[PDB]
Write a structure and sequence with these properties.
part of a larger assembly, 6 chains, A mainly alpha (21), B mainly alpha (417), C mainly alpha (445), D mainly alpha (196), E alpha/beta (292), F alpha/beta (355), A: 21 residues, mainly alpha, D: 196 residues, Rossmann fold, two-stranded parallel ribbon, 9% strand, globular, binds zinc ion
């Protein structure tokens, strides 16, 4: 369902957060 | 290319797509990366061949073919419109791609668009059919005729190049080009009418030819020698199997942690030949039913234990509730994942991975405490009657976990101290 | 049910007569060959350690996969008075029959056999040209006599009395002739050793003293004998039945010596092929078998045409089919003969199409007939058109008060065999005139 | 009528272009096609430029069709004058010469398949009147021709090609030709001694 | 339920039984062994009728087709026995006594070799011969007097593997009866465990027929529905090739696969002289690097 | 003249088999089984179907390969409809490959080949393959054409650089591209590209193709491997397996991490080491030392024995079927000689012969 999408897009920005830092 | 382990780890969107495709891999991913806190870099570092398999599955394309010869329209003709066939047509014919790219969003809609495309004169022209002037076609697509002709001349220009010399027939026809004899018959000239205009079979031959060279250049994309090809190996020495043979030397070493004589064996042979020629008694062999009784005691002693084993000679049916059962299953699975990563850590043999070993060892201690509190919870929620089953079932993996801890402690005391 | 019939006759034989039969090693060997492998295993396990075992040890040894056959073996073992199950010390002490046990032990050890293997003269002669040919001659004569073609060498008078008194080849003297019963056609369809067992079963059923254990022991060592040798002429009743079975063609006897033919070994055990008959929608016969006996038995229900060396031909007629049906021959008997004479080519094609249709569905919207029905169902529909009726003649009542006379004087009457027709909601049910013994009292009461 | 369109899916096709430049590029494409293994089909004249010196071997020389007798066009005044001329001078028969010359052209075309003792192929000829031309055939060509092969049809031609490709789809013992078709120098010496 | 091809392997060696009867007091135990064998084969042919019995034994320098008789009368036994049984046993004892005449002829001929590999070879060839003729269940029985100290077993080990593979393909279970001072026969235990067989080592020649009747009577028709009473538990491992010690984890030479418990000296194979990569074996010798 | 023809055909076979040599052959093997669902294999020239006998004979080859070469692992690539697909990667479990095979049997074959695509992902599959693990692919093809998205020669040279040998088995006849493939793949040898003639010859090709292949000196891989046996423990409790995490009554222990696994011959999943038994390694000693052919003596000479040395049957007279092992000097019958050379791996005549 949809509940996997908010997990893996939060991780998408989480990976970008450590990418800039 | 993007084939290194670094690039496979870099393709996060592909990792996202394959994770979304899988299910137990997602569950493992939340438990490790999200719940436990595993970095995804060494999550996927143990799955690099699977990532490569997914990358190969996604990163492949088919060989080209003639869509127009194969596809027939079969009175409005029914069409089995396939978007794969549509893109086949698109990168088969950039003239069709350019006719598409300015018609759908600006001039007219998609269904009327492909209706005009099936209606068009260029449809049946570029298809396996000489174009008929009686056909009305599509007047909008009739503006692409001279554009596609410009494409034809440009493609001919880029295709034309100097020709290999021995193959070249132009050297033959230009060997003596000043010959003034007599021209050949009407047979040897191409098919023309009484007005001299041709039927265009040479033109359609040019088109199907140019299809073949587009195939050749599609092969010949981003993705001296005459002596060898003129040499003949028919009367030469055949290829020799240079394979090495193997020979063996055999000397088996014996294992690491009374003798009768020839006279003795001769006299016992004499005695046993004497007994053999003497007599054989039939019923002397029956045991005395007490030595036979102890034989039965020994036999049944074997039978009891062996058949008790043979009583327990999808998985087995379980008295665990499914929630607790699956929780133990997933904790066991992720702890196995830890321990495989620990063998990656320990068998690495690098000082570079020391902090990794330390932090993972902290994670394993957390796993130990998770197991202990798990067993405590099943104990206090079930009266231990099936918590014994849970502990016995998860015992070997925690035993190998303790093995790993003892190895780490002993090697730490050996190297550091 | 042949070994089952043998075991049934042995269980009809009372316990001490059975134990008298268990005295001798040859009889015990024959019975050992009769019993299933599980019971054979049980007795060979017990025979060398003289320990009465509780049943629970046997239960521990037995894996439950063969538990049903285990129960069959021990039930026959108990009912043959061969086991001694007693619950001494609370648990069922198990014991093999001791006379049987010691006789088997002596047979295995080669100890005291008392010439139960045979009272030998050992003055052997050739058996291929004398014994086998005399056996073939006499058995050919009795086989064609059981066919019905006239033949000079009739059977003996006691076996003629056997056919007369028994329901097997009923010698109807009102017509003056031996006649094939339906039991006679079953007898014809039987295997050779099955036929031998039928003959001895009828003969022992009618013979009375002629001692019973003499018959039993003598027959068992007759099965235990070998071929082509002379032997001493034993008991008096055994000797006179020996001369009787000499007149049967079983033994070649030179009036004390006698030479048992291949039939003793046949009694002991058995032994595009022969008898593979091509079925036809044309209803024409291409048999892969030829014998005068073959023509003799096939003429009863087939119009035949000519004989070749392996292929005797003819044509099935509906007149021949109705002839068989009027001979008392069952249509089931006829079709059973047809599976005994099936042919490999049609069998292979039927197996291929059987797998093909079971790949689709089990039902197939058609009735079930694995062999090609165009030869079969055309007969079988006519065989369905053979009897197709039922007649009741006798007492009949109607218009009952309610269903009070159908769940206890018709369900229990079904358990005893007194009524002929069962129709609860018609308020009428038919009974046989002889079976009016216990139908019409609880009806009165 | 579209049989070319439906046989498009099997291989490629090339035809002898009026421009020998386009023909040479066509040959390059066919060479690359047999190189990668797609393969193509060729059409040219028995009196064409391809028929006068172009070689084909071991995947290029595999089978060649001739359809009908390759005759020169009949109503050529130069041809008729030459026919009467050579008959007047050297008593050369007109129709016999025409048949012989057509067979010369056909044999020249059909000789572009075999190079050494290692190539192979099937030689297919399509006319009714071909049967009386074994004498006009060369000796080695008609040597492999059977009398039963003088009148065959497409069905058993297809069958025989299938058994041919199963036949030389398999290897062969070298000793069967070690000294009878191929010679060593010692084989040559042995034959010399046999002759003398 | 089937014509059961039954054949018994007999390993005959005067050194073996003389070691047995001088180690113990069982002088003449082989006589009781032969009598138990005769009784058990009589029981087998009493059970099945269409079954087969062949006897083949392997002496010190070779083998012999004891039963049946060759393709090219004294009576120790009695005439009260059945004719078939008496014929088979009389043929057997005649072959035995002729073989003892041969043994007396070449008694001081000494063989340190064992022809047991050829024994199972010829036995399996004749088993294949019988099964190919005319659907026949098969079970093979081996006999050993292991009281004599075995000189070498490693050369025997490879035909043991070959016959294990072949008989496992031929669906044959093979049981071991051992009589020796050693408790175990290792390769024989591997054979019983692998080939669905029953291992047993005993000492007493008495009660032998009882042991055969209790355990050795299992037939392939009814084998899988009953437990094998064997008690052994084996690992199918091996001693090291050049150092002779059993190994948990080690090395085999990737060419010849001789087992190496340690680093081969000379950096080369001790069985096929294959030199090895020094960088690779140094990497193998490297211990895990530990933080300080 | 029937026995004479049989004798001369056996002589031709013996001339083919004269090269009995103890070459080092490919033992640690990694296989890829390239299959094709194209429309060419739908043809009913083969009964019931080309694809049908492909399915059954492939199942047979899977079984034979897992028996003769247990330690190796084999993968399956399926070609179907312009792009090849993967259904079974390399595993010590034949069950997965068999289930994929019967899934393909249940489905319909149709399509057109892309051999470059098949070779490219096969290259990707053999990319994480160790050097001692020999890289080999088997090829079947029922057609005479292949379109590909790109050129094949760069793929050819790249796979040559990846040190691969490949056999190709065509349906109709020899194709020059496949011949060149086997040539360049196999160091100029073109014995690796063979075409059948019927199903019997086809099965014989399978039985040949199960066997390992000799290796050359120039592509030397002389090294060692860190091997260790597991210890099977007949356990008294349902117990988790390391791989599938399901409760099993008994099983093995890892030699290092003491974990259990369902099957052998398999690598460890945890400390990651190949766990086999003595059976798997003994399976190829008859490769390591072969059995040379036996001297069929002629009927002219007098013979030491007129009956078979092994099966013990009398020899016939017109021809002499007395086949003598040169290592043992004992004549044997043709039946025993053929059976020993096909199944057995020791000469009992040589056991009789003392050394
Ligand atoms: Zn080595
Ligand atoms: Zn598992
Ligand atoms: Zn491990
Ligand atoms: Zn032989
Ligand atoms: Zn030999």
């Amino acid at each position: 369902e949809e509940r996997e999408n908010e997990k893996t897009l939060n991780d998408y920005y989480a990976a970008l957060a450590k990418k800039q830092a | 290319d993007s084939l290194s382990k670094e690039k496979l780890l870099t393709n996060l969107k592909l990792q996202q797509s394959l994770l979304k495709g899988n299910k137990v891999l997602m569950k493992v991913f939340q438990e490790t990366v999200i719940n436990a806190g595993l970095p995804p870099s060494e999550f996927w570092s143990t799955r690099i061949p699977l990532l490569r398999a997914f990358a190969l599955s996604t990163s492949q394309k088919v060989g080209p073919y003639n869509v127009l010869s194969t596809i027939k329209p079969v009175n409005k003709v029914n069409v089995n419109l396939s978007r794969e066939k549509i893109l086949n047509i698109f990168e088969n014919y950039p003239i069709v791609k350019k006719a598409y790219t300015d018609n759908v969003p600006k001039n007219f809609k998609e269904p009327e668009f492909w209706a005009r495309f099936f209606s068009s004169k260029l449809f049946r022209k570029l298809r396996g059919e000489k174009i008929m002037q009686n056909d009305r076609g599509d007047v909008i697509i009739d503006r692409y005729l001279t554009l596609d002709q410009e494409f034809d001349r440009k493609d001919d220009d880029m295709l034309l190049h100097p020709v290999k010399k021995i193959i070249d027939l132009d050297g033959n026809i230009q060997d003596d080009p000043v010959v003034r004899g007599n021209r050949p018959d009407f047979t040897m000239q191409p098919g023309v009418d009484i007005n001299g205009n041709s039927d265009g079979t040479v033109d359609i031959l040019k088109g199907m030819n140019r299809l073949s060279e587009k195939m050749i250049m599609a092969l010949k994309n981003e993705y001296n020698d005459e002596r060898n090809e003129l040499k003949i190996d028919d009367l030469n020495e055949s290829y020799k199997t240079n394979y090495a043979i193997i020979h063996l030397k055999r000397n088996a070493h014996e294992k690491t942690t009374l003798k009768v004589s020839n006279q003795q064996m001769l006299q016992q042979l004499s005695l046993v030949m004497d007994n053999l020629i003497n007599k054989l008694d039939l019923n002397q062999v029956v045991p005395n039913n007490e030595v036979s009784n102890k034989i039965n005691k020994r036999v049944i002693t074997a039978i009891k234990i062996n058949a008790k084993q043979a009583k327990h000679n999808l998985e087995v049916k379980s008295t665990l509730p499914i929630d607790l059962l699956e929780s133990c299953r997933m904790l066991h699975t992720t702890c196995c994942e830890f321990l495989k990563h620990f063998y990656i850590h320990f068998q690495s043999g690098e000082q570079k991975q020391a902090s990794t070993v330390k932090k993972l060892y902290n994670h394993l201690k957390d796993c130990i405490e998770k197991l202990n509190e798990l067993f405590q919870d099943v104990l206090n929620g079930d009266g231990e009657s099936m918590s014994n089953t849970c502990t016995a079932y998860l015992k070997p993996v925690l035993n190998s976990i303790t093995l790993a801890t003892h190895k780490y402690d002993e090697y730490f005391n050996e190297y550091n101290n | 049910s042949l070994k089952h019939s043998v075991t049934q006759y042995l269980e009809e034989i009372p316990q001490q007569v059975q134990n008298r039969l268990y005295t001798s090693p040859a009889t015990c060997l024959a019975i050992y060959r009769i019993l299933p492998p599980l019971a054979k295993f049980f007795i060979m396990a017990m025979v060398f350690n003289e320990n009465e075992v509780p049943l629970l040890d046997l239960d521990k040894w037995v894996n439950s996969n063969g538990k049903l056959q285990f129960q069959n073996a021990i039930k026959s073992m108990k009912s043959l008075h061969l086991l001694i199950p007693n619950k001494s010390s609370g648990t069922l002490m198990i014991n093999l029959n001791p006379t049987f046990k010691i006789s088997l032990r002596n047979a295995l050890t080669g100890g005291e056999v008392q010439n139960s293997f045979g009272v030998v003269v050992e003055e052997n002669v050739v058996s291929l040209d004398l014994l086998d040919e005399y056996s073939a001659n006499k058995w050919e004569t009795i086989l064609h006599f059981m066919v019905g073609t006239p033949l000079a060498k009739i059977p003996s008078e006691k076996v003629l009395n056997l056919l007369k008194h028994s329901k097997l080849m009923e010698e109807v003297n009102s017509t003056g002739e031996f006649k094939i019963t339906n039991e006679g056609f079953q007898f014809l369809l039987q295997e050779i050793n099955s036929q031998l067992w039928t003959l001895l079963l009828q003969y022992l059923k009618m013979i009375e003293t002629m001692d019973l254990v003499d018959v039993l022991h003598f027959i068992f060592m007759l099965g235990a004998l070998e071929v082509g040798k002379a032997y001493k002429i034993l008991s008096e009743t055994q000797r006179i039945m020996l001369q009787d079975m000499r007149d049967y063609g079983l033994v070649f006897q030179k009036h004390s010596i006698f030479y048992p033919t291949k039939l003793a070994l046949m009694l002991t055990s058995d032994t595009i092929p022969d008898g593979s008959l091509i079925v036809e929608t044309n209803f024409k016969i291409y048999s892969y078998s030829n014998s005068p006996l073959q023509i003799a038995v096939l003429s009863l229900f087939v119009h035949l045409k000519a004989r070749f060396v392996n292929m005797v031909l003819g044509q099935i007629t509906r007149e021949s089919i109705r002839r068989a049906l009027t001979n008392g021959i069952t249509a089931d008997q006829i079709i059973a003969y047809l599976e005994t004479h099936a042919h490999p080519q049609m069998r292979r094609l039927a197996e291929e199409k059987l797998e093909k249709k079971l790949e689709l569905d089990p039902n197939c919207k058609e009735p079930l007939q694995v062999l090609p029905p165009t030869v079969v169902d055309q007969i079988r529909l006519w065989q369905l058109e053979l009897d197709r009726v039922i007649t009741y003649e006798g007492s009949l009542y109607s218009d009952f008060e309610t269903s009070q006379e159908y769940n206890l004087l018709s369900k229990y009457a079904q358990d005893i065999g007194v009524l002929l027709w069962k129709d609860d909601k018609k308020k009428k049910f038919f009974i046989s005139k002889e079976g009016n013994s216990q139908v019409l009292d609880f009806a009165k009461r | 009528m579209g049989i070319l369109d439906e046989v498009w899916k099997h291989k490629l096709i090339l035809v002898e272009t009026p421009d020998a430049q386009e023909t040479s590029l066509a040959l390059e494409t066919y060479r690359k096609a047999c190189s990668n293994g797609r393969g193509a089909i060729l059409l040219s004249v028995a009196r064409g430029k391809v028929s006068e010196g172009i070689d084909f071997d071991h995947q290029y020389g595999r089978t060649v069709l001739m359809i009908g007798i390759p005759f020169q066009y009949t109503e050529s005044r130069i041809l008729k004058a030459r026919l009467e001329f050579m008959r007047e001078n050297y008593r050369i028969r007109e129709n016999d010469f025409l048949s012989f010359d057509a067979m010369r052209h056909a044999a020249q075309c059909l000789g572009r398949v075999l190079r050494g003792k290692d190539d192979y192929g099937v030689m297919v000829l399509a006319d009714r009147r071909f049967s009386r031309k074994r004498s006009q055939l060369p000796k080695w060509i008609a040597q492999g021709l059977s009398d039963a092969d003088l009148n065959l049809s497409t069905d058993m031609a297809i069958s025989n090609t299938k058994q041919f490709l199963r036949t030389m789809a398999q290897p062969t013992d070298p000793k069967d030709q070690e000294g009878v078709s191929v010679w060593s120098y010692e084989d040559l010496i042995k034959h010399q001694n046999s002759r003398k | 339920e089937s014509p059961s091809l039954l054949t018994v392997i007999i390993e005959i060696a005067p050194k073996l039984w003389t070691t047995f009867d001088e180690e113990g007091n069982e002088k003449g135990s082989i006589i009781k062994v032969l009598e138990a064998l005769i009784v058990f084969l009589n029981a087998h042919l009493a059970f099945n009728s269409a079954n087969k019995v062949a006897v083949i034994a392997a002496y010190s320098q070779g083998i012999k087709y004891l039963y049946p008789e060759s393709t090219s009368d004294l009576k120790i036994i009695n005439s009260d026995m059945y004719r078939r049984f008496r014929n088979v046993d009389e043929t057997l004892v005649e072959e035995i006594y002729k073989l003892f005449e041969l043994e007396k002829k070449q008694i001081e001929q000494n063989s340190q070799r064992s022809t047991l590999a050829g024994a199972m070879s010829a036995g399996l060839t004749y088993v294949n011969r019988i099964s190919k003729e005319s659907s026949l269940k098969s079970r093979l029985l081996v006999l050993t007097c292991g009281s004599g100290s075995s000189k070498d077993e490693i050369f025997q080990y490879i035909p043991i593997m070959n016959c294990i593979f072949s008989a496992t393909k031929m669906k044959c279970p093979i049981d071991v009866v051992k009589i020796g001072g050693s408790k175990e026969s290792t390769f024989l235990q591997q054979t019983t465990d692998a080939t669905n067989g029953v291992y047993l080592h005993v000492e007493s020649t008495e009660g032998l027929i009882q042991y055969l009747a209790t355990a050795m009577f299992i037939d392939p028709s009814l084998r899988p529905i009953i437990v094998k009473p064997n008690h052994g538990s084996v690992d199918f491992r091996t001693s090291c090739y050049l150092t002779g010690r059993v190994v948990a984890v080690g090395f085999i030479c990737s060419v010849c696969l001789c087992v190496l418990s340690i680093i081969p000296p000379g950096n080369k194979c001790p069985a096929c002289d294959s030199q090895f990569d020094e960088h690779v074996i140094a990497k193998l010798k490297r211990k895990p690097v530990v933080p300080r | 003249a029937s026995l004479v023809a049989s004798i001369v055909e056996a002589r031709k076979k013996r001339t083919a088999k004269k090269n009995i040599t103890p070459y080092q052959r490919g033992i640690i093997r990694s296989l890829i089984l390239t299959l094709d669902c194209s429309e060419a294999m739908l043809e009913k020239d083969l009964r019931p179907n080309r694809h049908a006998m492909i399915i059954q004979y492939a199942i047979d080859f899977v079984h034979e390969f897992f028996d003769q070469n247990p330690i190796s692992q084999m993968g399956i690539i399926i070609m179907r409809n312009g792009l090849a697909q993967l259904v079974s990667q390399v595993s010590g479990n034949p069950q997965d490959h068999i289930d994929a095979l019967k899934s393909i049997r249940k489905q319909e074959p149709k399509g057109n080949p892309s051999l470059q695509n098949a070779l490219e992902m096969a290259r990707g599959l053999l990319l994480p393959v160790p050097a001692h693990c020999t890289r080999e692919v088997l090829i079947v093809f029922g057609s005479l054409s292949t379109t590909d998205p790109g050129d094949i020669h760069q793929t050819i040279d790249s796979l040559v650089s990846e040190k691969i040998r490949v056999k190709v088995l065509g349906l109709s006849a020899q194709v020059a591209i496949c011949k060149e493939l086997c040539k360049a793949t196999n160091y100029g040898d073109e014995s690796f590209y063979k075409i059948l003639l019927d199903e019997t010859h086809l099965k014989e090709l399978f039985n040949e193709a199960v066997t390992p292949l000799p290796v050359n000196k120039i592509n030397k891989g002389f090294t060692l491997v860190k091997m260790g046996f597991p210890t099977r423990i007949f356990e008294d409790t349902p117990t988790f397996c390391s791989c599938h995490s399901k409760l099993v009554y008994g099983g093995y222990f890892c030699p290092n991490c003491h974990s259990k696994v369902c099957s052998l011959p398999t690598v460890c999943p945890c400390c990651d080491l190949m766990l086999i038994l003595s059976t798997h390694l003994a399976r190829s000693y008859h490769h390591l030392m072969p059995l040379k052919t036996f001297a069929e003596v002629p009927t002219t000479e007098k013979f030491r024995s007129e009956d078979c040395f092994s099966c013990q049957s009398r020899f016939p007279i017109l021809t002499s079927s007395r086949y003598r092992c040169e290592d043992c000097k004992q004549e044997f019958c043709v039946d025993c000689d053929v059976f020993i050379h096909e199944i057995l791996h020791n000469c009992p005549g040589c056991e009789s012969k003392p050394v």
